[PDB]
Design a protein around this ligand. Sequence first.
Ligand SMILES: *Cc1c(COP(=O)(O)O)cnc(C)c1O
Ligand SMILES: *Cc1c(COP(=O)(O)O)cnc(C)c1O
Ligand SMILES: O=C(O)CCC(=O)C(=O)O
Ligand SMILES: O=C(O)CCC(=O)C(=O)O
Lengths: 435, 435
Amino acid sequence: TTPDRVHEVLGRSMLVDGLDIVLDLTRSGGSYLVDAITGRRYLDMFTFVASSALGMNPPALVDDREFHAELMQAALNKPSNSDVYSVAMARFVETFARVLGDPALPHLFFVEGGALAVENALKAAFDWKSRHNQAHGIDPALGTQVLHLRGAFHGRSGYTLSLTNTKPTITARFPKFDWPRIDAPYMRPGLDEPAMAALEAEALRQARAAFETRPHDIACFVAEPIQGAGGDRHFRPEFFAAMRELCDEFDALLIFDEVQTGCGLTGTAWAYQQLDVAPDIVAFGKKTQVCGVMAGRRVDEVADNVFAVPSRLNSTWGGNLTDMVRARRILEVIEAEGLFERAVQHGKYLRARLDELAADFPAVVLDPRGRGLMCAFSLPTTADRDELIRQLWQRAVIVLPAGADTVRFRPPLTVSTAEIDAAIAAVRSALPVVT
Amino acid sequence: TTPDRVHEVLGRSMLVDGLDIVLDLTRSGGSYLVDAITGRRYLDMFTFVASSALGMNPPALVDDREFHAELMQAALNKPSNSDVYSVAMARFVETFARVLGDPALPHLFFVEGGALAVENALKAAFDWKSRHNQAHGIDPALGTQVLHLRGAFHGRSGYTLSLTNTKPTITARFPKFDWPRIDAPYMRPGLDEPAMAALEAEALRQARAAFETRPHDIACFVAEPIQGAGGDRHFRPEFFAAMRELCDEFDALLIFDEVQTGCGLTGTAWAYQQLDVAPDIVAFGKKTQVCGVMAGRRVDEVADNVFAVPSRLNSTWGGNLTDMVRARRILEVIEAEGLFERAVQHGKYLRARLDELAADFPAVVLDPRGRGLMCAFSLPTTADRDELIRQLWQRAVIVLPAGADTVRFRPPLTVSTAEIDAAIAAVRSALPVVT
Ligand SMILES: *Cc1c(COP(=O)(O)O)cnc(C)c1O
Ligand SMILES: *Cc1c(COP(=O)(O)O)cnc(C)c1O
Ligand SMILES: O=C(O)CCC(=O)C(=O)O
Ligand SMILES: O=C(O)CCC(=O)C(=O)O
């Protein structure tokens, strides 16, 4: 079949509500997607929903002849990495620990899928809490609840469906656990030190209340260090530090969902390294191709936890070998070419450009925020927001909406300053058309 | 790193309880895995836990130069197929419908992971039931329960953790929904027409009881057409036909979990095609590389179900493009070379060989059963079973245990009769050593 017929063929079998183009797999490159139908090039600030670290067809992977052989060798088959090991797998794991590892979290576990990575993090926490309870003469049936935030997005699976609360179409009509949910004390425009502290104290009040009223039953607290789909909602390090302390007071683990924030986007390997808070478990995915968890800190206090006992966690494949080989090579490019620092430099620049926009359009471009390359701004009404996205589309710039009123930028770690300019230029163009 | 160091390197980051070999990705072929450490060749009746349809490095994929280009092109990147379409994706989907499609189930949906495929099937059923309830003046909060069997294995995720009940280490200490579970009236040795019917009626009694006592609240019934991990437990078509009728009487969908049984292993595309029972939804995975669901029959009776409304079901990637391209080529080999029929022919043969074993070792080789290439037998004690597996390992034959006392065969659809003989010969060898 032919590019112009892709939508017709798919449309026979599935709901076909994605983008209006057909990806040219060979001709897309860097920060540009190519439409196989028209040949048109689209500036990509979307990156497969922030899941691509280097953009399409990065030269270091495309030109590497030894890599082509390794990738091919891994792609022809799909071994069950859970029980059948290989050199290809071992190199991925050791380069993961070197480039993304945290010496406090030596336990690695791999799975296909972001939601199922968060889920294995929760499963780790449920087991930990039950056994810790048991070892302290508390009933081991206790320890089955997850403290989480409003506007959190953690996945669309059995357990994450009880955590995710953004658009109601994601969770409506699906069975949930009744788990304690608390307000998200994220930063807003026009709120100074005291007003922020007051707002956090209110979330902390709610957190402690939950801990006290379901005694020994809350296994952990999960959070995105910056809420993504919820609307690029950022939190002061102060908030998580209080949360960390409070999790310890009540013998709960703190888990961070870094599936969106992870792997360099914020300017460090993980966002948490900038908030100066130590998690017990971290869930990762998207940019890392394979998903999974890093665990340690208090997890090791329970000698027979889920990473020490066979068959507590498992999936058939244990992650996709091809993903593992690609991610390995991706991680080597990130390290060899200092892409974390490039994300800080270029994130300072994108942020600055959005400050200029906010100044030039004060009533329209609201709350320019960002950490590293992870930036957004808001519009007054959701109708404005949707119009700005359509306008950018017509000008061949792909961005992502979030929430009621947010436009988000998810550029590749390799975005150039010229490319950022091209995106901002397109926004300047579209703005008078929306007002 | 080097093959002899794979276990050491992995062992720093993860629990390392899999097989004792390092897979040679290039030199393994057909029904044989090669140990990269020793060069030893292992007869493979395990197939990455039944997830490989053609064995390692099948000649039709290895020699195909045009395919190498397509696979490479797909493997260099990991697009989000959920919103970015491609020719590569469209060919996979159309060849899936042609080779594995059922005209009653036109709705296809793809996801990475077996558990999450079953989960999307359940999510479809929960939505369907709530909205059907609503349209008939029943409360839409009702419809949140899943009827399922003892010894069922459906995955290790949020929802499937409430369904899976095999070894307690899979589910212990993880939060569950209280869902109605019923006995599995599978065939055993020495039970004729009447004794079987009596046993089914008892399961049916339990099924109806559950339906009547949680009115309008059971969204669906899930089953494996042949229970795999539970111990290759087979059911008479009569049982599912009564279940089908009973699901309709109470307005519940019948979902089949064909993740293990699927894609040719039983001699047809799906096992259900042999039981002459029509499911409303089918969950597939393993051999298909991409996982997902086929849906139709009563699902279409609810106009605004999960396949007609945007954003009810989703994952970031919508399945792995590389898996999709490989599976496409796999499906073409299955079709072009009549591998379904080859599975019937060679499954009749393996089955026959196990009948001979049962005769020669009547007190030891218990209950030789099988459908297509999906066969097993049992041993008297679990200690015998584990010893036979160790003995086969020493003789370089890989098989899979199941349950308390079962050895299962999961050969590639391409297994030769000589290879079956080699497996049986190894079993004959090991048996006197175990007694
Ligand atoms: C997307 C994401 C996930 C879910 O990932 P999937 O691969 O779609 O299952 C979980 N948490 C966050 C913060 C994410 O952005
Ligand atoms: C293995 C399998 C699944 C679970 O598949 P995963 O890929 O490991 O999540 C579900 N149901 C059955 C019958 C299976 O055999
Ligand atoms: O299901 C969705 O809303 C997409 C979720 C997601 O990954 C995101 O947009 O951040
Ligand atoms: O977790 C397990 O027991 C493996 C599950 C499985 O896929 C099987 O063995 O059939």
